[PDB]
PDB file of C-alpha atoms in Angstrom:
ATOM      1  CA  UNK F   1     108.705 -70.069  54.188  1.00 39.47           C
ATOM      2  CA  UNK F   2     105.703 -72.356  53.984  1.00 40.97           C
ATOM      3  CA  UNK F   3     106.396 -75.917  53.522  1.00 40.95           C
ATOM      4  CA  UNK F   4     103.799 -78.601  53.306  1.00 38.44           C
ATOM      5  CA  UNK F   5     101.386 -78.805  55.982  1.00 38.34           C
ATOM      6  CA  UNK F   6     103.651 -75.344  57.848  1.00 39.96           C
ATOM      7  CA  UNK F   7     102.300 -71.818  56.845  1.00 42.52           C
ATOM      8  CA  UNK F   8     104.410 -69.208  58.752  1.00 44.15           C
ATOM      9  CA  UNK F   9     105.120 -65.668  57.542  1.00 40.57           C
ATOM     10  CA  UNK F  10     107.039 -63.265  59.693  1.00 39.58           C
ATOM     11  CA  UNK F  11     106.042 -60.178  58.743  1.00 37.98           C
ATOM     12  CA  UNK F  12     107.958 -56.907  59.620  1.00 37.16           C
ATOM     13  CA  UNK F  13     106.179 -56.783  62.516  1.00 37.98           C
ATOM     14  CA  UNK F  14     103.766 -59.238  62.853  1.00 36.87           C
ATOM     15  CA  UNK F  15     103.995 -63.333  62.645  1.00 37.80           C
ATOM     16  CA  UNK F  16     101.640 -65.238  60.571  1.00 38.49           C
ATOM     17  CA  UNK F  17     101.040 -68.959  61.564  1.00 38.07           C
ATOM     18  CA  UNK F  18      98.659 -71.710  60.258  1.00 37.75           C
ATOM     19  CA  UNK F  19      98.880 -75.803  60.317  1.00 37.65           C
ATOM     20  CA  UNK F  20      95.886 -78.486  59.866  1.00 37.53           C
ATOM     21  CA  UNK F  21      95.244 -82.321  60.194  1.00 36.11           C
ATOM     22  CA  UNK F  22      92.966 -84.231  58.103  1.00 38.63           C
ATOM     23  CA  UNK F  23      91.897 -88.005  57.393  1.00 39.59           C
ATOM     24  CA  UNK F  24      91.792 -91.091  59.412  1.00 42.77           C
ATOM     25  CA  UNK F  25      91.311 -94.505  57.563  1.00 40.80           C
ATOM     26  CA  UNK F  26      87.727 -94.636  58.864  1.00 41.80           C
ATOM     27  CA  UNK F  27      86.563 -91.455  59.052  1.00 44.46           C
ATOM     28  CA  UNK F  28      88.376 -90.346  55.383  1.00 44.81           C
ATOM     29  CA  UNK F  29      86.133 -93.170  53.709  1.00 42.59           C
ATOM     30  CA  UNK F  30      83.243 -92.280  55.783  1.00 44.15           C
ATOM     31  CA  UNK F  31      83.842 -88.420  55.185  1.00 47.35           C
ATOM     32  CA  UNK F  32      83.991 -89.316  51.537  1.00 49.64           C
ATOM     33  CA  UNK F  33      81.262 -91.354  51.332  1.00 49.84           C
ATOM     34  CA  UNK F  34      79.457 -88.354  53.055  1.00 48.77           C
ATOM     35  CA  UNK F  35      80.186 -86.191  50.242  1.00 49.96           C
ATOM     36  CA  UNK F  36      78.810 -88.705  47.589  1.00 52.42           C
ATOM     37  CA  UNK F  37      75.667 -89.110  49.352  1.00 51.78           C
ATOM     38  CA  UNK F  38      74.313 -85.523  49.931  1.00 49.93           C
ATOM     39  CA  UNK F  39      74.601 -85.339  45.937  1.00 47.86           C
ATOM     40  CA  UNK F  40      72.097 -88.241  46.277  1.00 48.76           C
ATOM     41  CA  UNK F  41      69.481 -86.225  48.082  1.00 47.11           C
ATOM     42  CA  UNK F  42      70.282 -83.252  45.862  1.00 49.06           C
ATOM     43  CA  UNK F  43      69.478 -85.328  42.933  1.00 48.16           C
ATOM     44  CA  UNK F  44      66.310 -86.957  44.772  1.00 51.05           C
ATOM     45  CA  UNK F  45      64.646 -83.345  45.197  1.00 52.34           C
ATOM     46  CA  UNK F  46      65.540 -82.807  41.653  1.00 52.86           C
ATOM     47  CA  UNK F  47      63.449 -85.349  40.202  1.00 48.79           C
ATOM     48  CA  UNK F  48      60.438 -84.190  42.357  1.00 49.82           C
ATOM     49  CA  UNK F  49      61.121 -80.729  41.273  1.00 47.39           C
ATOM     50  CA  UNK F  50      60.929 -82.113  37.757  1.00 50.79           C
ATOM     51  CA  UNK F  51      57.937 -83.954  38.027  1.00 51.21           C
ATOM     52  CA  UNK F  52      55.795 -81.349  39.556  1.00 47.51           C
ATOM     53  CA  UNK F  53      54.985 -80.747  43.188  1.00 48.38           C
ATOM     54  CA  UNK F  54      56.897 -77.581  44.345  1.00 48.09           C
ATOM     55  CA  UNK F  55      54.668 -74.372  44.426  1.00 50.19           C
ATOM     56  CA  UNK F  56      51.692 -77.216  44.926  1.00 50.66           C
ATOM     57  CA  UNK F  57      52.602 -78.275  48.084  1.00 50.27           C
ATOM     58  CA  UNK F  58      54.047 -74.876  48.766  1.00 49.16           C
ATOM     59  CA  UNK F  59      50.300 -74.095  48.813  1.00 50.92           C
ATOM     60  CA  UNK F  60      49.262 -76.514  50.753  1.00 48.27           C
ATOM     61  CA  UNK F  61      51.330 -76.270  53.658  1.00 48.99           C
ATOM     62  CA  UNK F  62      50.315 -72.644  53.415  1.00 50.36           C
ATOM     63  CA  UNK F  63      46.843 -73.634  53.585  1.00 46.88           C
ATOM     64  CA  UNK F  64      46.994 -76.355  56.068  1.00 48.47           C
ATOM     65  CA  UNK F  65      47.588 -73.528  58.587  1.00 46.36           C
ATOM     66  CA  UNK F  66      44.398 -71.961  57.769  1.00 45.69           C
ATOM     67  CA  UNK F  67      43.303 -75.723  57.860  1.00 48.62           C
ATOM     68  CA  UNK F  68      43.771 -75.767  61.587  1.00 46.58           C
ATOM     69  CA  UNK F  69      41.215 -73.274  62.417  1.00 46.84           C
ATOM     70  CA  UNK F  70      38.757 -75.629  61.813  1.00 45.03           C
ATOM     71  CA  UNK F  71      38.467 -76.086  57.852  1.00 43.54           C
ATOM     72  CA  UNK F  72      38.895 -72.776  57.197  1.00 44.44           C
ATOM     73  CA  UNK F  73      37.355 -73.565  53.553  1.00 41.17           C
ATOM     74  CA  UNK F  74      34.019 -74.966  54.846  1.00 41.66           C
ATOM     75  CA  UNK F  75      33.667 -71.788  56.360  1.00 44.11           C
ATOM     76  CA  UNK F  76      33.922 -69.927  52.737  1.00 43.16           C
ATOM     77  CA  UNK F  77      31.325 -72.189  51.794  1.00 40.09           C
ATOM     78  CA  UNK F  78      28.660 -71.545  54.706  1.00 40.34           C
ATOM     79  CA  UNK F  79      28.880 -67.669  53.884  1.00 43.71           C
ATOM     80  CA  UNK F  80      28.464 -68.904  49.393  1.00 45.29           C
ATOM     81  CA  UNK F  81      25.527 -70.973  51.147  1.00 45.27           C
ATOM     82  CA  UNK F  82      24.117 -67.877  52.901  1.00 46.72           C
ATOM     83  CA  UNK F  83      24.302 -66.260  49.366  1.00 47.49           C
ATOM     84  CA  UNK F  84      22.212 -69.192  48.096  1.00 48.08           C
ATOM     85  CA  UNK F  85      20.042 -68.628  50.923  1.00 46.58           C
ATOM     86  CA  UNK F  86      19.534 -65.261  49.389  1.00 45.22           C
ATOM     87  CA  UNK F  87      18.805 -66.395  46.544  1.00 44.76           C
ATOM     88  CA  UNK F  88      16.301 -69.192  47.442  1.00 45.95           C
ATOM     89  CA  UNK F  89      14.244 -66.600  49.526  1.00 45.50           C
ATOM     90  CA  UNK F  90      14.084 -63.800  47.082  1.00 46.29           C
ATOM     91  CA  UNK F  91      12.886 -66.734  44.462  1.00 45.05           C
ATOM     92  CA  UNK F  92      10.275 -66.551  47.192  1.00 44.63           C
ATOM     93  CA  UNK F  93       9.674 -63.183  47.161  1.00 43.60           C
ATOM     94  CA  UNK F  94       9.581 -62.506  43.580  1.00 45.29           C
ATOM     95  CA  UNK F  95       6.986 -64.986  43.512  1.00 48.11           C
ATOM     96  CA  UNK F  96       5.215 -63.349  46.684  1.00 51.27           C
ATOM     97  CA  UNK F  97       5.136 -60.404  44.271  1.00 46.63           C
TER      98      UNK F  97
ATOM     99  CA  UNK A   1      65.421 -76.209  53.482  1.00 45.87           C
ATOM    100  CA  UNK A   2      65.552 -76.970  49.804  1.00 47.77           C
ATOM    101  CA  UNK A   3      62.371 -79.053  49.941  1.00 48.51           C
ATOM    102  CA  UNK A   4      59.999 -76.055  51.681  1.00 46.81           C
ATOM    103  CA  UNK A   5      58.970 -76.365  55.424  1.00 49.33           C
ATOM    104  CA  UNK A   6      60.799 -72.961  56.775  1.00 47.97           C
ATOM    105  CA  UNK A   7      58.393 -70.048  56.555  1.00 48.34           C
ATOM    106  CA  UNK A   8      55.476 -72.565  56.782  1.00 50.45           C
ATOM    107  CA  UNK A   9      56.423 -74.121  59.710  1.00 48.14           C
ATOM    108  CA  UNK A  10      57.456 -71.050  61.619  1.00 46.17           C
ATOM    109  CA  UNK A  11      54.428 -69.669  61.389  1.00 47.87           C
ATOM    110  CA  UNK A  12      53.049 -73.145  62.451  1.00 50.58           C
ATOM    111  CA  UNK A  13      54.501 -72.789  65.477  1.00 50.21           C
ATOM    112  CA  UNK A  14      53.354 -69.595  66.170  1.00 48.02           C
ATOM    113  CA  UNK A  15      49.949 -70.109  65.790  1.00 45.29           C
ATOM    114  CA  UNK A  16      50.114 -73.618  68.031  1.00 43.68           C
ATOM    115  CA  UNK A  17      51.062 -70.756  70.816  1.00 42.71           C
ATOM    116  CA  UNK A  18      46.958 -69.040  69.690  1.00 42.81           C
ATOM    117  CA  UNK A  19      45.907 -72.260  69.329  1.00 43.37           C
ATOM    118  CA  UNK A  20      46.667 -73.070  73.045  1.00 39.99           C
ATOM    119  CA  UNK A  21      44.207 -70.308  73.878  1.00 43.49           C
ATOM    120  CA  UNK A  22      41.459 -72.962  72.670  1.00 42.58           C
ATOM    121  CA  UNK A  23      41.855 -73.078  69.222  1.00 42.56           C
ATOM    122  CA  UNK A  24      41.926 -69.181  68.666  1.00 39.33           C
ATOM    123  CA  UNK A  25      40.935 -69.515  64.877  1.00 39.38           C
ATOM    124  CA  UNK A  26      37.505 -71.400  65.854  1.00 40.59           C
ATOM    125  CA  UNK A  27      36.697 -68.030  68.146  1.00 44.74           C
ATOM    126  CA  UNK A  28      37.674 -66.252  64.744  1.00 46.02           C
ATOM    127  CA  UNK A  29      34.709 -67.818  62.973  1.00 45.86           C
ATOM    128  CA  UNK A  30      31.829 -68.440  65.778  1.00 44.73           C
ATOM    129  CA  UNK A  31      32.105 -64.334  65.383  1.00 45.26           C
ATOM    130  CA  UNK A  32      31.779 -64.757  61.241  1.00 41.76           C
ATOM    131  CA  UNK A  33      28.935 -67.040  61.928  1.00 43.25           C
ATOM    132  CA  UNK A  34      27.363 -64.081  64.015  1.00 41.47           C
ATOM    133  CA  UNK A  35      27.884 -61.701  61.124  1.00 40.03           C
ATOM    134  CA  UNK A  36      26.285 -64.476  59.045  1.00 42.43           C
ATOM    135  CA  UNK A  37      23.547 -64.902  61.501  1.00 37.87           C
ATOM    136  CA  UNK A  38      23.305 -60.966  60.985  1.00 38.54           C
ATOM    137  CA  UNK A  39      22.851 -61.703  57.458  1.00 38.66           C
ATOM    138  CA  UNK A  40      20.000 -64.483  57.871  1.00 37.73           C
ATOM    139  CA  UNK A  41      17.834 -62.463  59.852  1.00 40.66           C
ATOM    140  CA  UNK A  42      18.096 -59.698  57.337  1.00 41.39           C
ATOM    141  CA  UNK A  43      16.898 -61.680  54.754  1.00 39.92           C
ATOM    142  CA  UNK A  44      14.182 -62.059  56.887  1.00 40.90           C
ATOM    143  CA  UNK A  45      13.541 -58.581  57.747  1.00 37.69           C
ATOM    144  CA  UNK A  46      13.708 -57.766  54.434  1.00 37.78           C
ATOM    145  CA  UNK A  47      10.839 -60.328  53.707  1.00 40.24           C
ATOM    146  CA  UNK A  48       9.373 -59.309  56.407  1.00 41.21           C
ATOM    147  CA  UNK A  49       9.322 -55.522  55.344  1.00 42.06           C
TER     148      UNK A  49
ATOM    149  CA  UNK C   1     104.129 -74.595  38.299  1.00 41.87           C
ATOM    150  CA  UNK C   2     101.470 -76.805  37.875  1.00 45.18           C
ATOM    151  CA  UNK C   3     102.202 -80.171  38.248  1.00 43.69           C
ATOM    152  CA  UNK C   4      99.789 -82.851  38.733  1.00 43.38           C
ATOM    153  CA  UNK C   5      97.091 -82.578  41.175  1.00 46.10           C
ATOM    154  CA  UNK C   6      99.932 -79.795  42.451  1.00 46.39           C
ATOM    155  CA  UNK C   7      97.901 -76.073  41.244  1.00 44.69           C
ATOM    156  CA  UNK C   8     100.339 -72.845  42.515  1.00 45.99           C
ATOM    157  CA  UNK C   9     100.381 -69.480  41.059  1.00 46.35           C
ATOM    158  CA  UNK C  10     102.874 -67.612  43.219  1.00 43.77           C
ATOM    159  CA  UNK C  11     101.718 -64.043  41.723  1.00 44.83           C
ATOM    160  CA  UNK C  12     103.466 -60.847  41.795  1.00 45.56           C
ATOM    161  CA  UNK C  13     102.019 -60.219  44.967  1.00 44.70           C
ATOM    162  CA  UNK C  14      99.809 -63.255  45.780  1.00 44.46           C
ATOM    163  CA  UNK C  15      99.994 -66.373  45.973  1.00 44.90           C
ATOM    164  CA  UNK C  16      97.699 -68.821  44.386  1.00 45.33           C
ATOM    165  CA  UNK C  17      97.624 -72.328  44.857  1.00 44.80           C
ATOM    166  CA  UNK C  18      95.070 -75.457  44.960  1.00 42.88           C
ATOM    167  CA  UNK C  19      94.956 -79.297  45.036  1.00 41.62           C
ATOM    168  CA  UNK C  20      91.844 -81.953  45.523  1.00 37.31           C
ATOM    169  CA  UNK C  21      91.412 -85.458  46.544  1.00 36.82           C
ATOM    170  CA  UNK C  22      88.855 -87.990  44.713  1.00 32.89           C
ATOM    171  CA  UNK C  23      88.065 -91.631  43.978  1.00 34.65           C
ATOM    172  CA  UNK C  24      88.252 -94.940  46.734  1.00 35.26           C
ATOM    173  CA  UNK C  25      87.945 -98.460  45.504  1.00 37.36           C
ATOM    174  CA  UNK C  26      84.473 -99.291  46.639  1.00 36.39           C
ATOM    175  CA  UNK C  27      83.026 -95.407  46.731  1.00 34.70           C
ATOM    176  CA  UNK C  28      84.261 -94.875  43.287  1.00 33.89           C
ATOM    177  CA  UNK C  29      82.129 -97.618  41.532  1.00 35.05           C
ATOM    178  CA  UNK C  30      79.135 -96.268  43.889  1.00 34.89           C
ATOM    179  CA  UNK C  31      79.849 -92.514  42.190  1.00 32.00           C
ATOM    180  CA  UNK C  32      79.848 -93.838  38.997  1.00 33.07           C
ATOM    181  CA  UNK C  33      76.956 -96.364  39.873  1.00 36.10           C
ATOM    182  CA  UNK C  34      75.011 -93.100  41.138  1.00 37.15           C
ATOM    183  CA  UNK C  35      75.847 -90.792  37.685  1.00 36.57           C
ATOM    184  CA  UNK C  36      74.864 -93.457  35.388  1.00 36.84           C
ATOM    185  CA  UNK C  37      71.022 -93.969  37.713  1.00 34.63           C
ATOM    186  CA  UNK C  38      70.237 -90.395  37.764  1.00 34.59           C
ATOM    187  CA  UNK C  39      69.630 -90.334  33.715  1.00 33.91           C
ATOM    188  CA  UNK C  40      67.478 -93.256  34.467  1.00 32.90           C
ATOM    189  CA  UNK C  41      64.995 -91.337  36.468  1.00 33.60           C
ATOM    190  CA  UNK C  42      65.706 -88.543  33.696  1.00 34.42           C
ATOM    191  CA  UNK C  43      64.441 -91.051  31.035  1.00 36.81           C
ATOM    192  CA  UNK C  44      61.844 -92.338  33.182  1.00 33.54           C
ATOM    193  CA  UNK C  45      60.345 -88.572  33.656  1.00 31.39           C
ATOM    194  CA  UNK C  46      61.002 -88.416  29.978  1.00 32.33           C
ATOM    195  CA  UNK C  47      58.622 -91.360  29.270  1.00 34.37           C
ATOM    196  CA  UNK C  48      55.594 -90.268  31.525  1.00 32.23           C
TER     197      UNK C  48
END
């Protein structure tokens, strides 16, 4: 026999029960209002989605990690200047020859 | 959530706990500098050979 | 018996039913307000 705001259902052997309250003035304008906003935001990262960013900064956040170490890319580049070390030496040496 | 962070930040986090030690990842490359050092004086060795 | 903003469906066995609340005064020029910006930015992606 559920009536409004009163679900109740007896069952053969069991009872079933369930009532709720909602809205106040205040709140239901404010709860609303609520609702309308967080479409807002969803619409905000939307745009930036449809600009570009994304998998970007994805990366870059990623790499700002390895950032922390100390540069982590300068580091890449001392060993590439090693290698042009190499290079510069054995320019050296094949004109030693 | 929908922007990024998550993941990235978790394993920010993380590595702040290493980077207490004293900046753990600078430790990880004074060692790759030694290998590189290794490298440098074999370029020498093998101009000096 | 649908009636309104009144959605039941008392099934053979089940019972179906369903009703939703929408629009206030000053919030519901704001909604519309906040529809009719977001093809803006669309148009203004669209340009660039």
């Amino acid at each position: 026999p559920k009536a409004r705001d009163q679900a109740v259902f007896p069952q053969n052997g069991l009872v079933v029960s369930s009532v709720d309250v909602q809205s106040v003035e205040p709140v239901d304008q404010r709860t609303r209002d609520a609702l309308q906003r967080s479409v807002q935001l969803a619409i905000e990262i939307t745009t930036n989605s449809q600009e570009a960013a994304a998998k970007h900064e994805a990366q870059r956040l990623e790499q700002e990690a390895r950032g922390r170490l100390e540069r982590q890319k300068i580091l890449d580049q001392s060993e590439a200047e090693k290698a042009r070390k190499e290079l510069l030496e054995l320019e050296a040496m094949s004109m030693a020859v």
